Symmetry: C3
Subunit: 376 residues, 3 copies
Amino acid sequence: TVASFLGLLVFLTPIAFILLPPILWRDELEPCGTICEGLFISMAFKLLILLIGTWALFFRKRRADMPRVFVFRALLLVLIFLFVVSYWLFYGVRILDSRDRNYQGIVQYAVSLVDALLFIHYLAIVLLELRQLQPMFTLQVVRSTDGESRFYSLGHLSIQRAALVVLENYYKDFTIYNPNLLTASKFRAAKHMAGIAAAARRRDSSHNELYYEEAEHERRVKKRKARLVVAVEEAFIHIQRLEVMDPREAAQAIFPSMARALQKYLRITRQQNYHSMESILQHLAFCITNGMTPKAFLERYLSAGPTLQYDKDRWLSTQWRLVSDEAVTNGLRDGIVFVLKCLDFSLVVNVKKIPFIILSEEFIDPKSHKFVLRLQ
Amino acid sequence: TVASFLGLLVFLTPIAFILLPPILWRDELEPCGTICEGLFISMAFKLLILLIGTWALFFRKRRADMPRVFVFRALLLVLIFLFVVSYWLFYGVRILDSRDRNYQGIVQYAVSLVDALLFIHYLAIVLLELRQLQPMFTLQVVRSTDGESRFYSLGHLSIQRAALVVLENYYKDFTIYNPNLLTASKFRAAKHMAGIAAAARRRDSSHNELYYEEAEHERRVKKRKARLVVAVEEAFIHIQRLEVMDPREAAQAIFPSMARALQKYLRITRQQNYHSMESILQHLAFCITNGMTPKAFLERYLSAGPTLQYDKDRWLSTQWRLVSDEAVTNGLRDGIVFVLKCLDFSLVVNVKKIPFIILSEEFIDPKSHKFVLRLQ
Amino acid sequence: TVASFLGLLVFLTPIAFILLPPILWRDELEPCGTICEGLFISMAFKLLILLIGTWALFFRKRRADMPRVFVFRALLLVLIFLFVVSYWLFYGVRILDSRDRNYQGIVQYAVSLVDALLFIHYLAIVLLELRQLQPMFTLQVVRSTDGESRFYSLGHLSIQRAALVVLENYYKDFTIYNPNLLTASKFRAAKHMAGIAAAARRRDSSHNELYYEEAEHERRVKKRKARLVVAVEEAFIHIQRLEVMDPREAAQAIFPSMARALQKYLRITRQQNYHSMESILQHLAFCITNGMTPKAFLERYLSAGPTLQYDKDRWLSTQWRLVSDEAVTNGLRDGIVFVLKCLDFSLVVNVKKIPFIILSEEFIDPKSHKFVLRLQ
C-alpha cells in the first residue's frame, strides 16, 4: 500500500546503509573481521525486536476519523521523516561521496540508526497510549435528552481523543437512545402549551397526574414483565436438549408461545423499534444454543440495555459532531465543556480536574480498639 | 529455582563476555585505557536498569493457567533463547577460538548485548501489557442463569487472555452465583410440566400468579430489611467505644440481639448459605473495629454482592472451562463467541468491534445562544 | 525553578561532555571525520526523543501529597543522581585530567550516556505507570456511614498509591457524603437510648415503624419528583430558542416557575445544602445553553450524584488520612485493610488477591446442538 511501503523503506534503511559499501566499493573496505559481524548480529536482533513491536502496536487499521489533525501521530511522522531524510543526507553527502574506509564505523552508524528508531517506537508508545494512563481529569458525560450521567477518568488527552474515549464508553455504558421514551414529556409540554410564582403555586395545589400515571405505568410494566417471564419459561420448557432440529428451528418452534407477551412487553416499554422478529429469533437460537435460561434470554428485553446490544444500523457511528469553544487539538483542562452531538441527542461533557489530595498517617493503636458492654 | 537460574544466566552473559578475555589471555589484550572503562560504567548502569525493570514487571508469580500455550511469552522466551545462544555462538566461534585483540571491541559487543536485551525487555512489555491498552473490542459478558450482563473494552488479546480479563472482572463486578435464587423458575417450569398460539393466549387471559407473588415477596423482603436495620442499629448502640473487651467479644456480645432478624432476612433473600455465623461475627468485629455504622455493616447482607465479598472456597477459580469454536490462541475479532463455563453457570461472551467513528467540527457561535421570553 | 534546573543539567550533560574537548584542547583532538558526525546526529535525535518523552510523561505538576516518601520516584532520583555524578566523576578523573585523544571515543561515551538516560526514562515509566497495569489485586471500598461499596482492580501498588487511586475513584464513583441522610438512624438509635434474645423477639412482634415510614417517605419523594418534573418541563417550555436575552437571564426568567417545586424536592431528599440558588441558576443556564431537556437538567437534582458534581469547597481533598496497620510504602497483598478517613466518614478498604484461575478447553460440537420438540 502507501504507509506499508514507507514502513518497508524505514525498515530497510539500515540494511541499505549496510549492503551498499560492499556493492559500490568492494575492494576499498578495510578488514573488519570480528567486530563488524558481532555488530551485524545485534543489528539483526534489534531489527527483529522493532518489527515485532511495530506489528504489535501499529499494524492495525485506523480507529476513528478526527476533526483536526492528530497532533502526536503527525509529530511522530514528521520526526520519522526528518530522522530518515537526515540519515540519508549524511549517508549520501559524507559517506557515499567520499567512499569511506573503516566499514566498522558504517556498521555503528547503521546500529545507531536502529537504536534511535527503536527509541522512536518507544516515544510513539509514550505519546500514544502511555501519556493518558495516569488519570489526570474526570469527565462528566450527560445525555441531553434523558440525562443519563456517567463519569470517566482520563489522562492528558486532546479534546478529540477524550471525546473518542467518551464515545467508546458511550456505546459501552450508556443505555441506547430511545426517542419514544422521550415523547411523553414533549406531549406534556405541548399540552401545557395548549393551556409567575403564584401560577406555579397553583400547579402544586393541583392534581399530580404524573405521579399516578407513572405508578400505573410501572404497575402495567411489572404485569407485562411477569406475563413475559411465565411465557418464556414455558416456551423454553417446551424443548428438550437430547423431530431433531437445529436451534434455529427450535427458536421458530417455541417463539409463537412467547411472541404475544414479548410484543406486549416491548410495546409497554417502548422497545418495539429495537427488536425485529428476525433479531429476536437470532438471539433466541443463540440462547438455545448456549444453554441459557429464560431469564438469561429475557434480560436483553427487560431493561433498555446499551447501544451495542442492538443492530449495526442502530448506532450511527458516522454522524458524531464535536462542539468545543476552543481548538479540539488542545489538551484537556479544568472547566472546559465539549459537546458530542448525534442526530437527535448530545453528550454534554464537562471536564474537571481531579483535585490535589493530601494524605497523612494517623496511628490507631490496636490497644485502642477496646470496647465495653455499656450503652452509648 | 529454574527460571531464576536462567534469568541469572541471561543477566551474567555480558559479565561473562567481559571477564573472560582478562582471565584467558591476560597479556594479549591491547591497551584500552579510557574508552573501555567509560563503556564499562554505561554497561553497569544499563544492567542495573535492566535488573530494576525485570524485577518491576517480571519478578512475580504466574497469574493463571491457560488452555493452550501463551503465544507472546513463548515468543519472548524463544527470542531470548536464540538471542543468547547466538551471542554465545559468536563469542565462542569468532572470539574465543581466535583469542582476539582490541578488547574495546569486545566491550562494545557486550554493551550491544545489554542494549538489545533492554530492547527485548521493552518488546516484552510491548507484547504483554501495552498491546491491549487501546480498547479495540467490546465484550458482552452474560451469565447463563440470571442473565446479568456487563460490557468490557479490551485491546488486541487472544481468546485466552480476554477470557481471563473477563474472569477477573467477573469476580469483581458480577453478583455471586446464587442457585437458590434460580430454584423458583425451575419449579415453575416443572409445574408447567405437571400440567400453540391460542394456548399462549389463554395464558395471558389467566391469573398472573407471578406478578402478585413477586410483589408479596418484595413486600416481605422490605419488611425483613427494616426489621434487620432496626435490630442492627440497636445492637451497635449497645456498646460504647471508650468490662473492657476486644471487638471479637463485642461482636459476640451484640450478635444475639441481631441474629434472628439477620437469619430471617438471609432466608427471605436466600443468602443463608453464603454467610456462616463465624463469617458474620468476623465481619461484625471488622465493622466494630473500623468504626462503621449499622448500615455500613449491613450493606454486605442487604444486596447480593459480588463473588469476592465471600469465602475463598465459595469461588471455584480452578474449574473454569473456555469453550471457543476456533483456537483460543487466536486474537479477538468482531462476531466471535466464547463461553466460560463454571460448575453450574456459564459466562457467554460475545465480542463486537468498537465501530469506526467519524467526528467533524460544527461551530456554534456564542452569539447564537440568544433566547427570548416567548413560548415554544 | 529547582527541578527544571536539574532537568536542564541532566539534559545538557551529554552536550557538556561533547563541547568541552574542542574548547579546552582544540589542537590536541585526533581527526574524527565521518564517524564522529554520524554519531552526533544520532545523539541529537535521541536527545530530541528524550526531551519529547520527558515532556510527555513528566512535565506536569505533582498529583498528590503522600504520607511517607514515594519509593519509586525517590529510587529514580537516586538513580539519576548516582548516574550523572558517576559520569561526571569519570569525565573529570579519566578524561579531563588526562586530556585524552581519539575524540570519537568521547562521542561514544556521550551517546552511551544518552542511551542509558533514555533507558532511565523507560525504567521510570516501567516503575510509575506500567507496573500496576496488570490487575493483580481487588479492593473493596466501603464508606463507614451509608455502606456504599465498590470494587476496584489494582496492580502492584503501595498502600499510598492504591489509596490515592481509591480516592480518585471515590470522587468519581461514590455518591457524595450527605450527613443529613444519616440523621434518621442516629435519632432512631437515640430514641432507643431514651427507652437479650427475648427482648429482640419482642421487637419483632412490635410494630415496624420503619417499614411504613420508609414507604410513606418514598411516596412523598415520588410525589415531589413528579411535581418537579412538571414544573421544570413547563419552565423550559416558557422560552423559545430563536426581548432577546442570554441564557443567564433566561435561567433567571424561568427559575421562579420551578423554584418552589425544586426547593421542596431538595428538602424531601435532604439535598438543600448541596445546591445553592446561584449554582442552580448556573447549571440552569448551562442546560439552556447546551440545548438540554428538562430531564437532562433535572437528573443532577433527582439522584444524589457523586462528589464531583458539586462545588469545589464541597469536597475536602486536603483532609484525607491514611490508616494502615503496616507501613504505607509497603505494597498491596492479600488480606490487608487500610482506612481512608475524611472529616466525618471513612473509606474502609480491604485488599484481596484476585484468585489463581485455571482454564481448560472442552469441545462442544455444533453437531451436539441438536434439539427436539419434546418437553423436558
